[model samples]
Target: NLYFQSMEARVVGSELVDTYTVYIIQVTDGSHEWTVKHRYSDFHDLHEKLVAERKIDKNLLPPKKIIGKNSRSLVEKREKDLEVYLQKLLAAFPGVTPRVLAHFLHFHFYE
Candidate 1:
């Protein structure tokens, strides 16, 4: 058997919280696993800050929609898009996790 340690993250599902959808994210590294949740606005805020700090490509994040976000179809599509966005981010940063992303993923809480 061969083994290597690499962090993996995925948007597993979405929950309707109050008035907005909160995406459930599952993260793991070989053995440890944990869940973290984030709303669309939270992702947007994180993306904006990363872009402003010149830490990531501007197009790596999904666009924000002001209307029709409550529809099931829109939420589903955004869910997939966000998953892709997050996967790209993990691929962009290898070996080292950024401080902001670590905090967003609640890496400090568990470790």
Candidate 2:
């Protein structure tokens, strides 16, 4: 049942800039561990690509909002949503990291 066995990821935290929030995603595949910071737009792009190919569920992504896009309270909640989004994404393809996902997570850089 444990096909891939070693890959894991988490959105540990976020950094709030003047108008944008940067999410820190930590990835480990047993051999290496590193972090990648991305904005919600990056996450949106990844979601669109994967959904286009049906590699992941459309509902797995957190809905985007324009109003109060960078509020502390929203970003705090978004941090958790993004975390679960990554968790579910990896779970859906257990043992295999898709090309887009690998790139998004910066697996090529670390692994």
Candidate 3:
């Protein structure tokens, strides 16, 4: 029932490292919100946890990787993918997220 509406997101910004970049993203549920620091490795990390916790099935993991400095296009594409992935996740798992960990960066969701 928590997926009563839509989930939305925007890229706040990004920073570059030796070979890749990290994006700062903001998500909102029309009332509550969260900010996430994202890179693809973290998505895999989350998928592993969710699969282990049985919160979501392994086959449902969103598959798009955004990495490498030479990948601005991929970065942009994956940023968009990340937004859609989160939106879909909120839709699929709504009232029950935030209870788990996207632990590395720390964003919270609500009931």
Stretches off by above 4 angstroms in model 2 are 1-6, 107-111
Q: Model 1 compared with the native: what TM-score? A: 0.78
- Candidate 1, lDDT over the whole model: 0.73
Residues 22-48 of candidate 2 have per-residue lDDT tens digits of 788889888889889887777787788
Each model's TM-score? 0.78, 0.80, 0.62
Error of 2 at 45 (Å): 0.3
Backbone clashes per model, in order? 0, 1, 0
- On a 0 to 100 scale, what is the lDDT of residue 7 in model 3? 51
Query: How big is the positional error of residue 78 in model 1, measured in Å on the Cα after superposition?
Result: 2.5
Give the best candidate by lDDT. 2
**Clashing pairs in model 1?**
none
Clashing residue pairs in candidate 3 are none
Model 1 lowest lDDT segment of ten: 1-10
Task: Give me the candidate number with maximum TM-score.
Answer: 2
Kindly list the per-residue Cα lDDT of model 1 for residues 42-111, writing each as its tens digit: 8887788889988899877665744654544566677788999888877877767677776677642224
Please estimate how well model 2 matches the true structure, expressed as its whole-model Cα lDDT.
0.75
- The C-alpha stretches of model 3 lying farther than 4 A from their native spots are 1-13, 29-34, 64-70, 101-111
